[PDB]
Amino acid sequence: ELDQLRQEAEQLKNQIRDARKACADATLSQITNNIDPVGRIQMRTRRTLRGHLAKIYAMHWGTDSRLLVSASQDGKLIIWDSYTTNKVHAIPLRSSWVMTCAYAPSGNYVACGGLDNICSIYNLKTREGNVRVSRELAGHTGYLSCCRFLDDNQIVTSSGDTTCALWDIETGQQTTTFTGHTGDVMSLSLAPDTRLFVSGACDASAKLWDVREGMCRQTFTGHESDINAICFFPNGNAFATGSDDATCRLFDLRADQELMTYSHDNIICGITSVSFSKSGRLLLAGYDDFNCNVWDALKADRAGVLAGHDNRVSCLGVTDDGMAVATGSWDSFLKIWN
């Protein structure tokens, strides 16, 4: 019945809680006692990208670590070359309301989407010209919040309708659907092996999904408000989540608990984006205070801050080679830091 099922569910939840508790042998802060600190991380701005006439909403690096993309509310998706800062491509969008971007690992395709509830995939090497709209995936009932390629054919996206989807681009059909979130899914992150992916939603919870079977393997809680960003640890055995609570949290997959909390009394704004370093020792987090804080991932200490934007930092990313960090903002500018 109703109360029957609810009570057995609460019993199972208490069982899971006690199981997590019993497996708490020591805190990450207790094992990281003697690790030498990182030291003041001074990172200066090297390149600045201008050309957007509105507030940038997303960006994504290319696997080559040189080209990148950025979408703005002016209806423009620009592909830049960071080494020279000269715009390589500029794509107009059928809908000026865009909220996410994506760069294929092969660099042959780009993807975007927003309040139009459609994932638009553009080809960059069509056969004879510059750019043409390759596909339009329309199966969501809410705004598209994030998207990440798996290969030149499969693509996983998240929407505000509280569900995620895995599409086959060649066919334009949802090959799989992921349901279970009670709120709007605001971000997702693919694992290195592309076998799993974590998603954070406005229900103040995160979920680990398997891409093949299409089920939820683990649920992680602890935050107090919506989760706006999420990223995987370089080895895929953990992830980091940022929320409106002005705190980041590191969750573990094998332990199935929370390891460390990165927060500060002098920080009240909401976290807009997060990312790791090539070695995973640093955790960069772009906030709503116009700044970007660099935290130690093992000691939970703030070591450095990137303050060069006028408006809030909307997007943030790091390169595969780990040589620089790109950050976008509502002030219409992108910045590369080293």
């Binding site: 509310q73 309301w97 909220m99 309040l115 809410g142 705004y143 505000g160 709120g183 605001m186 406005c202």
Partner: peptide, 15 residues
């Protein structure tokens, strides 16, 4: 016209 959204407006209204 964004009447056909039918979701939490707190996330996209600022657009």
């Amino acid at each position: 016209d964004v009447g056909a959204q039918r979701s939490e407006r707190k996330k996209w209204i600022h657009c």
